[model samples]
Target: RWKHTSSLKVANEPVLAFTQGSPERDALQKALKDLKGRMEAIPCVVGDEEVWTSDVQYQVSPFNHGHKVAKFCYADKSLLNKAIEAALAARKEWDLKPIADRAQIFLKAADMLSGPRRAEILAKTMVGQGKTVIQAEIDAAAELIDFFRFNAKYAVELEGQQPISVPPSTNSTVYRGLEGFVAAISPFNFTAIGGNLAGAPALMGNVVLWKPSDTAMLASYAVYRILREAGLPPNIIQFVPADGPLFGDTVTSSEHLCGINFTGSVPTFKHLWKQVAQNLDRFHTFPRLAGECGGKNFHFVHRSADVESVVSGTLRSAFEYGGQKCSACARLYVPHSLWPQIKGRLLEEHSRIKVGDPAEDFGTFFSAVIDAKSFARIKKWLEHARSSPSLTILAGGKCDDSVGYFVEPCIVESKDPQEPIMKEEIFGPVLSVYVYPDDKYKETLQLVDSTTSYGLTGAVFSQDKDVVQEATKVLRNAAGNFYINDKSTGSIVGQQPFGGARASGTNDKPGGPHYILRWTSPQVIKETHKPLGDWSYAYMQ
Candidate 1:
């Protein structure tokens, strides 16, 4: 076990050290041995090796590995197909259950997740997912608790709506929930992403078929166990981890798959749209789709903004979770007058950021990149930044991959606002700062507007009321979750719903009630005390 340190001093911890039968190593080995013994005593179906973590390239324990660890296993296509069929069959039985009964299961899951088991589960998340202890607790445990509680609340609230208005003749208005199964494709960045997406449909009395990213299966499996323990039918929500595109194709192409909830890359989302559109005629029902895709988010700092606060705020957005979050701010627009001061403070803060093992919890400012792919991509983006003629690398542009994936927090100064680095989603800890002359404020807004094909998130940090108001009003279409004197990421569930318009995605809905509405096909149930015989004739007249 890693001990927590209070002092912010560097210790003589090995950079790439491996233990050889030490107490910590011995204890871990013994625990695994004990766990294997316990598993042998359990009555359960052991999945194929291909669907097990032992077959994955990185087999780090979900609860204890350091940053850069990957703990999930990709499910075989055959297994995934089987899981889908099973879910379809289960949905018939699950949807027939009373809504109150379904809600009770979700509530029970929430209670189970709030117990000691959750703490043990979250410890693995902190190490494997490269989250701080606090972040792991919130993301792995608290968020699930919140989702379950919220779903239970929504179950009751969904029943309290009034019937749609109609003439008093027919004495009928159809009101119904979404038909068939909901397939949720969740990301690995947050454990709760799966819980929320899967639980949301379940709240509406729909059965779920989930495809969790291979990166988050262990945590997801723990959630699965909780749901089962809470009295959800064994096959009500089937989890199948597989290749994203392949699994996506299977789900979107299925006739029984009623709705899809996805959170991942833009390309994959586009592919899903194409698949759904191509096979629209084959499905039994009009399938609904909800997605939270890629974001090339930005932060705007005006001349009137507070420099220190902006610096701290921007760092929090860019560095938190090593910029893996969809809403992480990748670009910044700073006023020419404050450029020097902002740049100086940003660099100072960047240097002070610790970078190392997430388990250590103190030495490093941020955890390691999630995998070799992310590490390599960040390196390539850094090279692009270095080679840009119009951009200057200000601080921390190095990549260290000796033992674990590590990328130095980067700050770049751009001469032209239209530079490729400034306009695109780097999706890493690379911040491109663009300075605009005072007279170019309006032009800069236009530049920001036309800069990226993405519009998932945007922000403005300005104390001037007129500027903030005008910018907010004008840039209304720039982001889904707009911010003032705050970072674009870090949106709370109820307060700031996620998603954006334009090329970011379809404006069908964002992530809160608006998003949830997509999963439901509600009809009005209107009734009258008396029936009218001449209603048809009246309408004709």
Candidate 2:
């Protein structure tokens, strides 16, 4: 109903620094208090209906286990099928609308999130998913807003690319939504990702069945409501939380499953991919599988690197939000010459990092791991580090989950670079450091490149330009998001365009201009204005 624009300008959402006594801080605090006092009931939203199933569940605060933030219900197999039907029913009307019309809803939602809904999402993410104030701000607030706004702009840009036309004829490319619905299975680590996994596809005129992480239910529901309030039609994106295996099986087994937007473990992604392959005969089209699995990201140090910067960057990347981030630095490759100084600095900062309730203690570096399962997993790794001959606990290797699922930000020095701690993806507050001889920096670069199955995010800390160039060249395929003299995590949308290769994911850069195109299936159209059009070409005749 509106004229399509050639250009749309958009900027990343400004991350509000919720410092002491600031308006944002006060608002966030109030939201946290209110959320803590009440139990929010979240239901499986299929079209306009909120379906309450018998399989009830509660999402509790990771730091305060006794406190329940959201009481949700799981949609059974039949309910999931119903949700799929609802999405299909809503698809044609939503998809037929112009891209500009679709973009408006997301833009409005972004504004809502940037203004009124900001504190609410941040609070839910913090208490429900165990993120610190700044972490939640960067994630649930700024990043989510950025995804909505930027993806809209990108979609518009995509739609503007029309084919060339000859005289008396016109050519155009229609960015059609897929014939079927998408399954967006998001992770608990990032609230923004949960929003984008569902929002991006919906922006590109695709219907979606968003199965949010059980641990991140509250914030996901908040996002769903914000989109609805922003004028999204019912059933455009169905909020159907179900058991992981059940959801996977049902979606894969469906004939209308168009795509799978996933972010979680490698095995889960593989399983889903296999399921789609196994059920290939049942589908109308080849389902697009876009996944961002966990990574064993690393920070490789050179003798010429800035020791202070390395220590600070590593601390932030490895310990922030209990190191639950997908790109969080799990391994550190340091030069033997600079190990002592870097170790001292890391230890000093590590000591000051407080592990407590994030809302109550705003200055705390991190709170707790997501839940009991994660806590137990991290504890087992700590025990292995303690007893192993090749590993020594450098600092802060303690686990005390008496009241909460808290694990201290740990640093383990490995005598062996190939140790399990250095190679594995431990999504906890644990950093494994491997000090290498200064002469073997090149070899160490090769080691870093080959250590993990994930090629996600990694950084090279080197002041020497030649060394930086060399490392970048050698580690070209080592990381999708590579940083020089910086941390291995925190990739901003549009600027970094985060994703990975190899086992990490499909490497579909979600924040980039092209991510929107993945959701669209283009169709070329040509119109002839001439009175008589020949059936065959003149040359053929």
Candidate 3:
């Protein structure tokens, strides 16, 4: 009844360059040293309560399979219930506060992580998840900071949504938090994603029960502490790390569970979707399901394209972070006349990509895949490509895992769009391509659209105005993130909002107002200065 709301302002966190002879480089060395020496215990916290058990799960480094980075105790049935209760309890005051106040907590969290907490998160991510120094900084540090900052800004805008009022009257809209809590399931690939899945909902006045992937918990716990220290009340977001479906089952079945934000494989998201549907009647309302699933994301190169720019974007997009990113370009479509020319440039550039341990080799362009399972999956796909009649191996196709889960960037050339290598989501440094006749541009456009149920991202490259305009119209629903001349992977906040439709997700583009809207329910409130003469209307006469 007594508060004025204002926007919480923020700016992008600048990525640090750890160049030799610089302060940033010196700081990284120290943080990395500290991280290597530390032995930390992870846990699930609900309210002020912490659950510690004898059942142990170890966090193993992808860079060195034998090394242990951290360990945690899996939450059980009791802890899951406690975490749910904790989020609900926090919801009491969290949802009632002025939007600015709620936003400040997140903005402060962002600011702190952007500066004082940067090196720690960067180091932790590198050791725990095997990201290179630069990769860790951009992701765990810079990108996570961006999410917190942007979501805060989006929350203020969401609450300001209002209805038009007539003379002697005022109208307002109440952007109410979801009636129940949000279950945020974040993945291992992006530490920023882990923060966004939780921080985004919590910023919109909803409490969050965050379940970060077990493999990514080292940096995740650091993020939890960042939120706590930044004036977020202890119970506002509970960190619950449990074994597989144990934690998810407790939340999904509860009437108090309201929404789920997920980022992972197709099968896992589908399983969660099926569970929510089966238990739909148990909920007080329909639970919002927001997911960013695997993508067979692609890039199409036309004969009119600038060959140099296409090569740069294609190589960087397909192999950055070992192609583990959901938006990576797994397939390429090139004009038939340009295939051999493009193939030459691709191999020349790919030859220079160094595949090794990210932690030890700062100069290495390629890092190990997260685990043996991922390595095996990529290996099997490459082996199939080697034997298949529909596909011909091109460029690189080798897997060496004696040291780490390493697969040299593999490129497969195919005329058939339906080849298993072309359509499947390898989620590794594997790129597939098909060559099309220059005149058959329309046919190739149709081929890209129907080839995959997943439509997370895609791109078209051409210098010709007609080719660019034609591709945009033809592949309208092909990618939620449709790129003309640029790579499809780098979606930024307050700029390029990212997500997809069809099986890729409900297309909830993160880092925008619409995404915040998903976490809220709006109610219009109107008040008149002059009252009606009577309760009954003129019709009563």
How many clashing residue pairs appear in each of the predictions shown? 6, 0, 0
Which residue window of length 10 is worst by lDDT in model 2? Answer: 1-10
Global Cα RMSD, each model: 9.4, 1.8, 2.1
lDDT of 2 by residue, 1-541 (tens): 2234478999899888787879999999999888866889999999889989999999999998888888999989999999899899989989999999999999999999999999999999999999999999999988899999999999988887887888677888999998899999999999999999999999999999999999999999999999999999999999998899999999998999999999999999999999999999999999999988878999999999998899899999999999998899999999999998998898888888899999888878899999999999999999999999999998888987887899999999999999989988889999999999999988999999998898999999999999999999999998999999999999899899998998888889988998888899999999888886677998996
> Whole-model lDDT for model 1 versus the true structure?
0.69
Alpha carbon lDDT of each predicted model: 0.69, 0.92, 0.85
Q: Estimate each model's TM-score.
A: 0.84, 0.98, 0.96
Candidate 2, residue 386: lDDT:
98
Please tell me which predicted candidate would have the highest TM-score against the true structure. 2
Pull out the clashing pairs in model 1.
Answer: 63-124, 75-241, 354-364, 354-365, 355-364, 355-365
Candidate 2 yields a Cα-based lDDT of: 0.92
lDDT of 1 by residue, 1-541 (tens): 1222221111111111115644433433343233331211111112211245333434342223342333455556666667666666666566667667787887777767666455545644555566654456557666667666655665555555544344452232222457777778888778878888787787666767777766665567677667777887755677666677777877777787788878778788788888988999988997877777877788988899988879988998888778878788888999999988998888887888987765544345567666667788889989988897887899989988776677788888889887888767766788888899978897888777788888888889999999999898778888877999988876655456667877777654333545556656766544565854664775588
What is the lDDT, from 0 to 100, of the residue 45 in candidate 1?
18
**Candidate achieving higher TM-score, 1 or 2:** 2
| Between candidates 1 and 3, the TM-score winner | 3
lDDT of 3 by residue, 96-215 (tens): 888888889888888888778888888888888778887788788878888888888888866765667786777889888898999999988989998999988888889988888878
Q: How does model 1 score by TM-score?
A: 0.84
Candidate 2 Cα deviation (angstroms), residue 75: 0.4
Ranking by TM-score: 2, 3, 1
